[PDB]
Design an enzyme around this catalytic site. Structure first.
Site, PDB file in Angstrom:
ATOM      1  N   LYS A  54       0.833  -1.194   0.000  1.00 56.21           N
ATOM      2  CA  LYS A  54       0.000   0.000   0.000  1.00 56.21           C
ATOM      3  C   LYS A  54       0.873   1.251   0.000  1.00 56.21           C
ATOM      4  CE  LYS A  54      -3.512   2.840   0.716  1.00 56.21           C
ATOM      5  NZ  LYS A  54      -4.186   2.493  -0.580  1.00 56.21           N
ATOM      6  N   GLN A  56       3.894   1.436  -1.344  1.00 59.19           N
ATOM      7  CA  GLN A  56       4.572   1.622  -2.612  1.00 59.19           C
ATOM      8  C   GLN A  56       3.580   2.272  -3.551  1.00 59.19           C
ATOM      9  OE1 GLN A  56       8.444   1.753  -3.446  1.00 59.19           O
ATOM     10  NE2 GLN A  56       6.529   2.294  -4.492  1.00 59.19           N
ATOM     11  N   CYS A 163       2.971  24.582   5.751  1.00 59.03           N
ATOM     12  CA  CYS A 163       3.341  24.556   4.343  1.00 59.03           C
ATOM     13  C   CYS A 163       3.053  25.848   3.580  1.00 59.03           C
ATOM     14  CB  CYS A 163       2.633  23.393   3.635  1.00 59.03           C
ATOM     15  SG  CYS A 163       3.333  21.753   3.927  1.00 59.03           S
ATOM     16  N   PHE A 214       7.266  14.841   2.498  1.00 58.91           N
ATOM     17  CA  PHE A 214       8.228  15.760   3.089  1.00 58.91           C
ATOM     18  C   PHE A 214       9.718  15.501   2.825  1.00 58.91           C
ATOM     19  CE2 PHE A 214       4.598  15.478   6.373  1.00 58.91           C
ATOM     20  CZ  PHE A 214       3.760  16.255   5.571  1.00 58.91           C
ATOM     21  N   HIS A 302       2.425  26.115  -4.345  1.00 55.93           N
ATOM     22  CA  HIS A 302       3.066  25.257  -3.364  1.00 55.93           C
ATOM     23  C   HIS A 302       2.716  23.822  -3.724  1.00 55.93           C
ATOM     24  CE1 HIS A 302       4.821  23.760   0.274  1.00 55.93           C
ATOM     25  NE2 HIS A 302       3.693  23.165   0.613  1.00 55.93           N
ATOM     26  N   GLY A 304       2.070  21.039  -2.466  1.00 57.69           N
ATOM     27  CA  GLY A 304       1.663  20.261  -1.310  1.00 57.69           C
ATOM     28  C   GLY A 304       1.444  18.804  -1.661  1.00 57.69           C
ATOM     29  N   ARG A 306       0.607  16.160  -5.588  1.00 59.88           N
ATOM     30  CA  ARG A 306       0.222  16.155  -6.992  1.00 59.88           C
ATOM     31  C   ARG A 306      -1.281  16.393  -7.151  1.00 59.88           C
ATOM     32  NH1 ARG A 306      -0.656  11.169 -10.518  1.00 59.88           N
ATOM     33  NH2 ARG A 306      -1.359  13.101 -11.557  1.00 59.88           N
ATOM     34  N   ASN A 335       8.271  17.735  -1.106  1.00 53.78           N
ATOM     35  CA  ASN A 335       7.683  18.842  -0.365  1.00 53.78           C
ATOM     36  C   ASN A 335       8.502  19.348   0.820  1.00 53.78           C
ATOM     37  OD1 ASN A 335       5.889  20.751   0.525  1.00 53.78           O
ATOM     38  ND2 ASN A 335       4.625  19.284   1.637  1.00 53.78           N
TER      39      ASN A 335
HETATM   40  O1  LIG Z   1      11.505  19.532   5.928  1.00 51.81           O
HETATM   41  C1  LIG Z   1      10.192  19.431   6.256  1.00 51.81           C
HETATM   42  C2  LIG Z   1       9.254  19.764   5.194  1.00 51.81           C
HETATM   43  C3  LIG Z   1       7.851  19.662   5.528  1.00 51.81           C
HETATM   44  C4  LIG Z   1       7.400  19.257   6.823  1.00 51.81           C
HETATM   45  C5  LIG Z   1       5.989  19.192   7.060  1.00 51.81           C
HETATM   46  C6  LIG Z   1       5.389  20.028   8.014  1.00 51.81           C
HETATM   47  C7  LIG Z   1       3.978  19.994   8.253  1.00 51.81           C
HETATM   48  C8  LIG Z   1       3.516  19.543   9.549  1.00 51.81           C
HETATM   49  C9  LIG Z   1       2.092  19.518   9.781  1.00 51.81           C
HETATM   50  O2  LIG Z   1       1.564  19.439  11.004  1.00 51.81           O
HETATM   51  C10 LIG Z   1       1.147  19.860   8.733  1.00 51.81           C
HETATM   52  C11 LIG Z   1       1.710  19.852   7.398  1.00 51.81           C
HETATM   53  O3  LIG Z   1       0.760  20.251   6.480  1.00 51.81           O
HETATM   54  C12 LIG Z   1       3.015  20.422   7.270  1.00 51.81           C
HETATM   55  C13 LIG Z   1       8.351  18.927   7.874  1.00 51.81           C
HETATM   56  C14 LIG Z   1       9.771  19.019   7.574  1.00 51.81           C
END
Ligand SMILES: Oc1ccc(/C=C/c2cc(O)cc(O)c2)cc1
Ligand SMILES: Oc1ccc(/C=C/c2cc(O)cc(O)c2)cc1
Lengths: 388, 388
Positions: A54, A56, A163, A214, A302, A304, A306, A335
């Site tokens: 799941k 992958q 973000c 992330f 941004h 966030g 795709r 991200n």
């Molecule tokens: O290098 C990094 C890049 C991105 C993130 C993510 C952060 C984040 C944490 C959350 O609560 C909500 C989310 O939408 C964003 C953490 C480290």
């Protein structure tokens, strides 16, 4: 004597302008097409056979090919509490966060400053935006030292923003540069996943999805009003910057700082929330400027995810290409939270220039920059490209 | 079409001005002359006989008579991990922080807004400054809800700033109000000790001293350029705002966010560091204005401690009275971090008006506001009192 006269002479005159950009990330590149295995391996969740396949699936449709990460299979070994789903590890994560965040932010800054060509002494303000790494004095303090900034630089420590922090800094940088003459602001958005990383949970999917998104990476932006001819080179101008809260959104994106690191939730309804609220923001910021065709402008959204890109593109009806730069960064970096938009801005101009286009905004004049985050905040920044 | 024309019309015209103030704290008043006993009792450190007497000595010379505190002997019972010196309690502390911080901040805001007399709808920006209470969306988000602010208010979440954050907000509020026409900014500094409280350590004195200082309390400040005649009432004008880092200071004031709450160090050399750096800041900000007599101006200093007040007064050679307001707040509220300066500003004008003085600055025209915190940062804000 005259607070009225002091004001009249100490204020900038033109609009805030981006004069240089620099970016850097942890050397360690982690391949996406083999991450699901790596991840389930160092976490020792191999017996979760189903969840693994799941994962992958998730990693595939991710639209991400590469991601820089400080955390290594070695660093993860010396830190068992960080490989577990939930285990006391706040202290360890923060210490990496605090050490690594300023460190990479400085690498990005140096590159930006080298480009700008001016002496550091001229940096009047400092905006440091990171997801975490709490210490007093904060991460900004360390950056001042490492970089050797002036001891009187006005600091602005933006912690745990979300973000959408990409637009936040621009929004804030604008007022700083535009209200004070000679104000040259330095924006450093350094994001590191040491705080959000953890093991899989058969019950916590939102968390499992973030592990596939992330990434790490910093970006430094020099901003200032009234560009010095020839010496300074303007790249983009900040025209307007709005922020907005979508009703019934808090449960969409968010998280808490716990003893087990930064926890977070990402509700599937996000691409929708954005798509079904993205037009209002668009009109709000382009109507005043007579823009109705959102294809006549360049875009920097941004990344966030795709799905968000697909939905916004589908709602607003954008040619494919509009999101080509944005997706391009997502694929090679993932991200990096607040850093993404500046890697895209850097990518846009870098390419526009190697293409022979007339402006830094893909040959176009106007563009919009978005930012999406917690409580479901949307930040619409309107940019005006610069010539040649 | 003309980013130059948009700029020319969308910018404020006069200096940032404080138009209203409001303050509120947790109902629970804790008496200082009996705190040493209370403290050593609920922590169960009674056997530390020596440390206890030593703690009363500290509490006495504290110069504090009262302090509002959310934490009650009941709340401390249901939270054993918070009474211990060092014990995993980050989650509990944060949850009180997150619930109580916005809650009290709203009480302060309501009072400020009632005074201001204008509709909330007019609040364009929001600056929320708290020592902690990390959640995404953040504490500011909650404040927007509780208060019912507009969904497009531009937010600025200042987390973990330090005792000097009082000047920080003013510094930031200035640019916001002065660069955008009709911009009316709301500043909410809510500080709560749920994160810094813990038991005594025979080896950790710095920590034992903070237990006798830090208190609770919020403050809301309405700031905006170009006061509407009659409708709005200006109280003080922000003239200038500098920030400064004293070399060899990091080890003076600071702390980290750990799994056992917020830890902190306070080096005895602080009153000195300030005293031996306070003049440079003074001249830097008053020379441009022809002010050499620092007794010809009113004062509002962050009550980081009595010793700091004694030392600055001794170095700068201020009549006793100059620090009368500042000490007055310290005695009835203690050190509410970033909130103190606004309780003093509120106290100064409230008294000046009940005294029949010609201005809100103790009858004087110019005054200075300080802020002292981590990495040993000093923030010098120059104020210009308002008539009657
Ligand atoms: O290098 C990094 C890049 C991105 C993130 C993510 C952060 C984040 C944490 C959350 O609560 C909500 C989310 O939408 C964003 C953490 C480290
Ligand atoms: O309500 C409150 C009022 C004040 C404080 C103290 C914060 C603080 C923490 C440190 O690391 C350094 C210190 O100089 C300041 C905490 C809660």
């Amino acid at each position: 004597v005259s607070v009225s006269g002091i004001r009249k002479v100490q204020r900038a005159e033109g609009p805030a302008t981006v004069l240089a950009i620099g970016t850097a990330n942890p050397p360690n590149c982690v391949d996406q097409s083999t991450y699901a295995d790596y991840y389930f391996r160092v976490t020792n969740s191999e017996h979760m056979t189903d969840l693994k396949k799941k994962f992958q699936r998730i990693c595939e449709r991710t639209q991400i090919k590469n991601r820089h990460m400080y955390l290594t299979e070695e660093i993860l070994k010396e830190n068992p509490n960080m490989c577990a789903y939930k285990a006391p590890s706040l202290d360890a994560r923060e210490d990496m966060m605090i050490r690594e965040v300023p460190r990479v932010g400085k690498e990005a800054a140096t590159k930006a400053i080298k480009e700008w060509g001016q002496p550091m002494s001229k940096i009047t303000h400092l905006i440091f935006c990171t997801t975490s790494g709490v210490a007093l004095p904060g991460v900004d303090y360390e950056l001042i030292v490492l970089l050797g900034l002036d001891p009187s630089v006005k600091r602005y420590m933006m912690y745990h923003q979300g973000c959408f922090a990409g637009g936040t800094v621009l929004r804030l940088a604008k007022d700083l540069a535009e209200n004070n003459k000679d104000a040259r602001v330095l924006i450093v958005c350094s994001e590191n996943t040491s705080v959000t990383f953890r093991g899989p949970s058969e019950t916590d999917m939102d968390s499992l999805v973030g592990q596939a998104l992330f990434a790490d990476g910093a970006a430094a932006i020099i901003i200032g009003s009234d560009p010095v001819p020839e010496v300074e080179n303007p790249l983009f101008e900040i025209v307007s910057t709005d922020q907005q809260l979508v009703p019934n959104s808090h449960g969409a994106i968010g998280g808490l700082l716990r003893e087990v690191g930064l926890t977070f939730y990402l509700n599937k309804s996000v691409p929708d929330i954005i798509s079904q609220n993205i037009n209002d923001a668009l009109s709000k910021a382009f109507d005043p400027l007579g823009i109705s065709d959102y294809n006549s402008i360049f875009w920097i959204a941004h990344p966030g995810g795709r799905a968000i890109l697909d939905q916004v593109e589908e709602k607003v009806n954008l040619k494919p290409e509009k999101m080509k730069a944005t997706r391009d960064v997502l694929s090679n970096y993932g991200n990096m939270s607040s850093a993404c938009v500046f890697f895209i801005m850097d990518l846009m101009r870098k390419k526009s220039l190697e293409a022979g286009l007339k402006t830094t905004g893909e040959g176009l004049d106007w563009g919009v920059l978005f930012g999406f985050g917690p409580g479901l905040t949307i930040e619409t920044v309107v940019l005006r490209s610069m010539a040649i």
